[PDB]
Amino acid sequence: ADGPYSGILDSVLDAIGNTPMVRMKRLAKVYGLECDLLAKCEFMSAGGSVKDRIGKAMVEKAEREGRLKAGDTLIEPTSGNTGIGLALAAAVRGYRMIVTMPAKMSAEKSNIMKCLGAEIVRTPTEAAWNDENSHMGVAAKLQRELENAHILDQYNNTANPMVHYDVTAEEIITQCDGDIDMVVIGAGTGGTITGIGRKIKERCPKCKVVGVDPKGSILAVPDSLNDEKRLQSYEVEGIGYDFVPGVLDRKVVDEWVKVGDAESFTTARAIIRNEGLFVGGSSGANVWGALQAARQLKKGQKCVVLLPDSSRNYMSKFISDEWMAEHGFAPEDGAKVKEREKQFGGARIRDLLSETGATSDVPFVTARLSVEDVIKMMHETKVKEVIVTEDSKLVGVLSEDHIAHSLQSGRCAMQSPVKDIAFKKLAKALPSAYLRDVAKALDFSPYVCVMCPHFLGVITRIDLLHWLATK
Amino acid sequence: ADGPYSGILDSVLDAIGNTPMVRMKRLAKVYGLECDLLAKCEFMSAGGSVKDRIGKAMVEKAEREGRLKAGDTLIEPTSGNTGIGLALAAAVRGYRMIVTMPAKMSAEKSNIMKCLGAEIVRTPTEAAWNDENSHMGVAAKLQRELENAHILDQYNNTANPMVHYDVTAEEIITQCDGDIDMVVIGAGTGGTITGIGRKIKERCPKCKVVGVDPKGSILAVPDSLNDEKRLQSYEVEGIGYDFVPGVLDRKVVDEWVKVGDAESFTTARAIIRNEGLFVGGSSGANVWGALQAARQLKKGQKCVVLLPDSSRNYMSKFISDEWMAEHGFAPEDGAKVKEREKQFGGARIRDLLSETTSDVPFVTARLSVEDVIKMMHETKVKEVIVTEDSKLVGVLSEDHIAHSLQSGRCAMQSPVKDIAFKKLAKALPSAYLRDVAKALDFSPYVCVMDCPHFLGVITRIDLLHWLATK
Numbered sequence: 001a002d003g004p005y006s007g008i009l010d011s012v013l014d015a016i017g018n019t020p021m022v023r024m025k026r027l028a029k030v031y032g033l034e035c036d037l038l039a040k041c042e043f044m045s046a047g048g049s050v051k052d053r054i055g056k057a058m059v060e061k062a063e064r065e066g067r068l069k070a071g072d073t074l075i076e077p078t079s080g081n082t083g084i085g086l087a088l089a090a091a092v093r094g095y096r097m098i099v100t101m102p103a104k105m106s107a108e109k110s111n112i113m114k115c116l117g118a119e120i121v122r123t124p125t126e127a128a129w130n131d132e133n134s135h136m137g138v139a140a141k142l143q144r145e146l147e148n149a150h151i152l153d154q155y156n157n158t159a160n161p162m163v164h165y166d167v168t169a170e171e172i173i174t175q176c177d178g179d180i181d182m183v184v185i186g187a188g189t190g191g192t193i194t195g196i197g198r199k200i201k202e203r204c205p206k207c208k209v210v211g212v213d214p215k216g217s218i219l220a221v222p223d224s225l226n227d228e229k230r231l232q233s234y235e236v237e238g239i240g241y242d243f244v245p246g247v248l249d250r251k252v253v254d255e256w257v258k259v260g261d262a263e264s265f266t267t268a269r270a271i272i273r274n275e276g277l278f279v280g281g282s283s284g285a286n287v288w289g290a291l292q293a294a295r296q297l298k299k300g301q302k303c304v305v306l307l308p309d310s311s312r313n314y315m316s317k318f319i320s321d322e323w324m325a326e327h328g329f330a331p332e333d334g335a336k337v338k339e340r341e342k343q344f345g346g347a348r349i350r351d352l353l354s355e356t357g358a359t360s361d362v363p364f365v366t367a368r369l370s371v372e373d374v375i376k377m378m379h380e381t382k383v384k385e386v387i388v389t390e391d392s393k394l395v396g397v398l399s400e401d402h403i404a405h406s407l408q409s410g411r412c413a414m415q416s417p418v419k420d421i422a423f424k425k426l427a428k429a430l431p432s433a434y435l436r437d438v439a440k441a442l443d444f445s446p447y448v449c450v451m452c453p454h455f456l457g458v459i460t461r462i463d464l465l466h467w468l469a470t471k
Numbered sequence: 472a473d474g475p476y477s478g479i480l481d482s483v484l485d486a487i488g489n490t491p492m493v494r495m496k497r498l499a500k501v502y503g504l505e506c507d508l509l510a511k512c513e514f515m516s517a518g519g520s521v522k523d524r525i526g527k528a529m530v531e532k533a534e535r536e537g538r539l540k541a542g543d544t545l546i547e548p549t550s551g552n553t554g555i556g557l558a559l560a561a562a563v564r565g566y567r568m569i570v571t572m573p574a575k576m577s578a579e580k581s582n583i584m585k586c587l588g589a590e591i592v593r594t595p596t597e598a599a600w601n602d603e604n605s606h607m608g609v610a611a612k613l614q615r616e617l618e619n620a621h622i623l624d625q626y627n628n629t630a631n632p633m634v635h636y637d638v639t640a641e642e643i644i645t646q647c648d649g650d651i652d653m654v655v656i657g658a659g660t661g662g663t664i665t666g667i668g669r670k671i672k673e674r675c676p677k678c679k680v681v682g683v684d685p686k687g688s689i690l691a692v693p694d695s696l697n698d699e700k701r702l703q704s705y706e707v708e709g710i711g712y713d714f715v716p717g718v719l720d721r722k723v724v725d726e727w728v729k730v731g732d733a734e735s736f737t738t739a740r741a742i743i744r745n746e747g748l749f750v751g752g753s754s755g756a757n758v759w760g761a762l763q764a765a766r767q768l769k770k771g772q773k774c775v776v777l778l779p780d781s782s783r784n785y786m787s788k789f790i791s792d793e794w795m796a797e798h799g800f801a802p803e804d805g806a807k808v809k810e811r812e813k814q815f816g817g818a819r820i821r822d823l824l825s826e827t828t829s830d831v832p833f834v835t836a837r838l839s840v841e842d843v844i845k846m847m848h849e850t851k852v853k854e855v856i857v858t859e860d861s862k863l864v865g866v867l868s869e870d871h872i873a874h875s876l877q878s879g880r881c882a883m884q885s886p887v888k889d890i891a892f893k894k895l896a897k898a899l900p901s902a903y904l905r906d907v908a909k910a911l912d913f914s915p916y917v918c919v920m921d922c923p924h925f926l927g928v929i930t931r932i933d934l935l936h937w938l939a940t941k
């Protein structure tokens with residue numbers, strides 16, 4: 001039905017939470033999982049992260065105790081998502097936002113907090129928590145040097161775990177009908193794991209709670225698990241710290257699973273590909289930890305995994321195959337990159353141009369001919385396409401179909417220069433280039449053309465498909 | 472309460488729709504609007520767009536008529552969001568996806584449909600709909616040349632408007648309790664406007680329905696409104712075409728509002744800044760059209776605006792201030808860029824360095840940490856700059872030295888490069904302070920240079936303390 005959203009909401013803050021639990025049957029069937037892998041889609045909140053909750057939560061507490069008045073400044077050390085949630089709360093309730101975040105975090109989080117009118121101070125990646133150059137220490141300095149400022153300090157604020165204990169875990173309980181056998185959850189500030197594990201073990205003591213910690217952090221128990229990569233920088237954002245936060249109750253968690261960058265990102269892309277959840281990398285870490293932890297579970301048993309972040313914050317980072325190839329991360333089991341590598345391989349456009357049959361007789365023009373002059377060439381030379389080129393060096397492609405249709409449409413005058421109706425989006429290639437690169441380039445450009453300034457022809461996706469039909 | 476999500480969902484397709492309606496009181500107060508500007512947050516669907524619905528919808532129809540079997544290929548010309556929704560449906564129900572979209576559309580849509588295992592063929596921007604190089608014609612060719620392929624053709628499929636008539640408009644009706652006075656909605660394929668306007672006028676005939684069409688399209692009535700910029704390419708994605716789609720019933724819409732790129736993008740950023748809805752550019756166009764159309768309305772009256780897309784698809788495009796400055800679009804009334812322009816102005820780091828002291832020491836980036844602590848203790852400085860031979864390495868603080876030596880990351884005989892801060896931004900004295908602030912948005916330190924004589928380092932606290940002196 002429609003219970004929580006059946007009316008109109010006063011602000012975006014009322015749209016935080018109430019995320020849907022989805023059964024990842026496709027991903028489990030891919031990875032060979034007997035139990036039901038339930039996913040709590042926290043990335044479907046208004047701000048696209050679970051931390052929205054605590055943000056709102058902390059503000060509410062700060063307002064229910066009168067500790068916060070309009071016009072004040074809010075300061076918060078964050079990996080980016082708590083900053084986004086608090087920035088939403090401030091843009092709604094009229095507070096000023098100053099976010100202190102490490103340079104390791106993505107640029108999308110910074111851009112979104114900038115759109116929310118928040119000042120952004122960045123701290124070095126390799127800094128320890130004791131440092132004055134840590135995000136927490138810089139936030140403390142901003143408190144000390146600025147008036148009417150407040151640090152809500154999600155690492156020690158009781159609201160962070162208390163609201164995960166109050167609403168989120170109760171949501172999971174109501175959605176799983178109490179039958180929860182394993183809960184796999186990443187460990188950042190540790191508030192979400194603490195609260196969820198407590199409420200679930202209180203209303204279902206038989207549930208195992210598994211914490212996910214990146215290879216590089218010291219949050220796992222025992223230290224025999226953290227010493228694979230001690231204090232090694234990692235790319236996954238949100239989970240793991242160089243100290244145990246005040247809100248993290250490591251006694252409430254049963255197991256610990258160590259997950260590296262490669263597994264986290266490949267599993268995040270597998271989540272996107274197999275389920276269709278536009279989710280973050282920390283979520284890939286959590287899901288890989290869950291695939292390791294719930295392996296011994298049987299069918300009927302339900303393992304709840306949080307998907308904290310949305311792909312929005314890492315849209316340039318790991319959704320782009322460019323970045324994960326540069327960082328040497330396995331793309332995916334089934335991906336477009338691997339499909340192109342298998343189908344095309346090392347075949348080059350020399351091979352396609354020779355197998356198809358062409359003698360580089362692609363007529364050029366100086367890109368400022370009148371359309372009547374060029375139609376004489378189109379109709380008399382028996383060619384359909386032409387390539388327009390300037391002096392200062394490529395302009396584009398032109399088809400007689402577009403000529404006729406734009407002349408009828410009122411965009412192509414008979415005395416107009418040919419540059420006005422040519423296709424201006426192109427991708428330059430050269431015969432030694434592989435078909436995998438032209439396949440990647442066709443994802444962004446309609447045509448791929450090759451190149452004394454002697455271009456040999458144009459290649460589109462139908463050409464590659466018809467080549468694949470010959471193989 | 473908890474009605475729709477109180478259980479577990481079988482697939483992502485079950486999380487489509489059921490978006491919340493939020494009152495944009497902040498944005499209305501900013502623009503001076505008396506009536507209640509309600510926003511249907513369609514970007515909060517699972518796929519982050521309203522088109523998710525029709526995608527799912529069409530598949531269901533294609534499956535309820537037995538027209539679709541597992542392993543088949545689905546082909547669809549789209550501006551990107553219907554492609555995303557259909558790719559979600561295909562990755563869930565086991566169909567192959569081929570999307571045909573113009574090159575003008577953002578790269579985020581392409582990357583996301585790639586993550587969903589969809590083949591992507593791009594078409595030229597300047598092509599007309601009649602062209603074989605149009606997205607629709609290319610999709611038709613892919614149908615003709617590929618076996619087991621289907622085109623659901625959201626421009627003519629009845630599911631596209633029928634489901635907006637069935638669920639979305641009924642959602643709006645149940646959320647507004649029938650009291651809807653104006654409905655402002657963008658016109659792309661026209662399915663959403665057709666369906667929503669029909670269902671709302673059926674359950675509330677007094678409601679005015681306003682269509683939003685970008686300057687460049689021919690969907691507005693009459694053509695006295697389209698002739699400002701006829702067939703001019705525009706940056707807003709999703710709305711407007713060079714022909715009236717089959718599902719668009721232009722008789723069901725009352726008014727038409729022309730919205731350009733600049734207004735659309737500046738109002739989308741205003742939506743993000745004032746309300747906090749991470750929304751798309753087409754939504755900025757729709758909200759600007761609504762601000763123009765519902766101006767004569769009074770308080771109590773409710774004007775419903777759709778926010779079709781999320782910022783996700785335009786994350787590099789218009790959330791980045793770089794691209795809207797490069798495309799000459801007004802940033803916002805109140806923005807961080809304008810705030811830095813007012814606070815800093817044309818002040819350069821020459822002015823700050825002179826108001827505030829010269830040539831903090833350097834090291835060759837391979838000193839032992841014991842040698843560098845001896846240098847710091849003898850030189851009484853706190854920070855140092857590490858530099859290589861082939862040309863900058865970073866900054867180093869004695870605090871990090873002590874804490875990493877105690878933390879087990881800094882060996883007494885280790886090279887100083889291992890503990891230095893490797894993220895830096897290079898500047899030079901003629902640079903302005905607003906630009907160093909923009910660089911400080913992405914780098915912790917901003918250091919200056921001309922010989923390699925490094926005049927010093929500047930952080931955000933330095934700019935704040937300078938602003939305290941001014």
Ligand SMILES: C=C(NCc1c(COP(=O)(O)O)cnc(C)c1O)C(=O)O
Pocket residue numbers: 049051077078079080081082083186187188189190191192193237238239280282283308309
């Ligand atoms: C530490 C922060 N986020 C925690 C986080 C986590 C861990 O959630 P915790 O509430 O810190 O336990 C997982 N995934 C992502 C993307 C996260 O951002 C922050 O936003 O400052």
Ligand SMILES: C=C(NCc1c(COP(=O)(O)O)cnc(C)c1O)C(=O)O
Pocket residue numbers: 520522548549550551552553554657658659660661662663664708709710751753754779780
């Ligand atoms: C035409 C497509 N989108 C329509 C659209 C619209 C218009 O919605 P229609 O249902 O097509 O009328 C508004 N905003 C955005 C971001 C859109 O993508 C498409 O995804 O192929």
